[PDB]
Design a binder for these strands. Sequence first.
RNA 1: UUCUUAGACCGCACCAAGACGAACUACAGCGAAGGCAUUCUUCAAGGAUACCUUCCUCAAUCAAGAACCAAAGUGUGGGGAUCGAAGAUGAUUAGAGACCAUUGUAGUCCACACUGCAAACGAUGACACCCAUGAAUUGGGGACUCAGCACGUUAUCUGACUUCUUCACGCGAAAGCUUUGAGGUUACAGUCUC
Lengths: 68, 104, 135, 217
Amino acid sequence: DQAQVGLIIKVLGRTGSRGNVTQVRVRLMAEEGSPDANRTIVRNVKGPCKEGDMLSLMETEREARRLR
Amino acid sequence: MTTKRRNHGRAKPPCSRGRTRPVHCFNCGRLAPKDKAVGRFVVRRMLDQASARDVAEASNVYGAGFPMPKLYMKQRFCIACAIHSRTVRARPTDMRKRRFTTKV
Amino acid sequence: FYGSSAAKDELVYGVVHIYASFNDTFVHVTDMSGRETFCKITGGMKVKADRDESSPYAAMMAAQDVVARCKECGINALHVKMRATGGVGTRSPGPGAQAALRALARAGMKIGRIEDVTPIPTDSTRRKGSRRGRR
Amino acid sequence: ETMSRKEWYDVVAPKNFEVRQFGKTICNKTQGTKIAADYLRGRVYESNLADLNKTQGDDDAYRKVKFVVQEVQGRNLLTQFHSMEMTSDRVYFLLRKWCTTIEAAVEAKTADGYTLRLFVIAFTKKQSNQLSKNCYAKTRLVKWVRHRITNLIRQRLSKVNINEAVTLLTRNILRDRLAKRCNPIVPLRDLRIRKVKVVRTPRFDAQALLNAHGEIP
RNA sequence: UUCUUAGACCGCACCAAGACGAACUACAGCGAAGGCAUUCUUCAAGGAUACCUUCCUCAAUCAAGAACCAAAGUGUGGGGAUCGAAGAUGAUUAGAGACCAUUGUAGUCCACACUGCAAACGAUGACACCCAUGAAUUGGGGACUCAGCACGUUAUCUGACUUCUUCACGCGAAAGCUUUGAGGUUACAGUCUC
């Protein structure tokens, strides 16, 4: 795997409609000053989240919702 | 029957033309008169903000170097078309008479 | 090597035609000539199931095998030309646009002088459809 | 692979561009009597204007330039003008609804047997004091503007050769005059060249081509 | 369904053939109506305006009669790119030339003949008089080199199209109509016709 920490920088808002999934933004604290222009990816999350929560990322360069 | 709309859903006034050319739709290919047809102007981005950053990094002569172009188009829609993507919606009586002219 | 050896240690400008539609996405390779080419990639090779061959994921997965084959052709810098659809189609690209660009940039290829090159008519033939539309 | 029989070349442009080798291109080997050099002739190579010139890249990087291959020599490629083109997007930026679009085409024949369709475009501009929602104009104020255009372009370019005529379009000396002269008839917002297409090419001549490049790099 | 190693898709270059003229294009214009949109040239017109020119009642409206008339149809010849009734094939469905998808004939275009059948609507016949509130637009008129010019602003006027989503009186069963009438009509009569 890749386990790449990121801090939930804020609650982006509510996306989905099941009452299940929320769409939230992740900020990379994984970087040590390595170049990232991404630089804060939006990620869909499963279950409850809170700000300052670290979580591992199995993927990077995610725009989440897209047009689909 | 009842005159629901004075201008009849047209920008064509009575006693002038009585005929204005048909125009295709960019959805379903339906034809309607130009005046009836529902015009919008899009100004569609060629990159999302999120991706704009990443590409402007790898650029030197572009992005920072010149502001990115956009795809411009006019979009003439049918009635049914418009309503279903909810960019035109039903309004109460007082509001239906309002216009905003050709400005956004 | 196979690529540059008389343009080596200097950037070389390819051109990349990107055609995004709602059935597939294409990524092509041209060299500021268009008379000779090195690779033709389709979404449908990377991802199977026809719905998902025009999806964002298709684009990005394909894009990495642009970069793979460009660095063997001496190509480093890439001009890009984004194309929507035909002149009797729409004026909208599919979802495979905006995905491909970012995938290439992040993969260390330079990108400059992006353009919008698409066939828009002064006027053309009767558009496919009917008077009453598709319904 | 197919890169076993590939090779490279460059693309040399005239001396009236400020970058000579703006391109590095690829072509197949001779592979018998088929002969690589045959194919290379009449190939079109595009560019951006702002890369190819270091003057008036500010004014437009929204112009493109094309060429053809008149003669293969060395690893060079000796070229001549084909088209100059304004990008699709650039005219939309200008364009305002409720302002009249004018256009025109002009057949401009040079001193040489080269001949050029010069497409032109223009738009009307509301006066500083205004109350109208219209910038709409009379028809006599349309054709009359097209009149001076055709005159002034044909006039100049008649006695000026192909090479030096390209210069006027790239460095936009033409546009300035045109926009100035037409302005009293109707205030214009812009006047521009949309597209420059080459119609007739008169000859292939070693001398004229070679000389038009100056010294080959 | 359909097309592909006999190299499709894709990119560039060039050529062929036919249609069309985007955006700009509008609560804008012209035409008796039906209708009409690239550019240049060319032929004969039409409306509006300006005038201390000309004529002097030559008018208005209409059974009879005559001319024009969207699309689809019919005859003959030319053309046939695109789209496309019929037909064919694949789905969808309980059933499905269905609506959808891939195709495809007539037709779609032009010339010369017919047809005169539309929600041909402003569902509002034609001519004439009177009738108020505000802000605009479209033409004309008034206060070197297609050049004693062109545009704009202030104000006025005549002619057109319409908005007050602060239209006055009034009318109407109401919706609505308002110098642009369905108003000036039981206080019932300007004129003609269907």
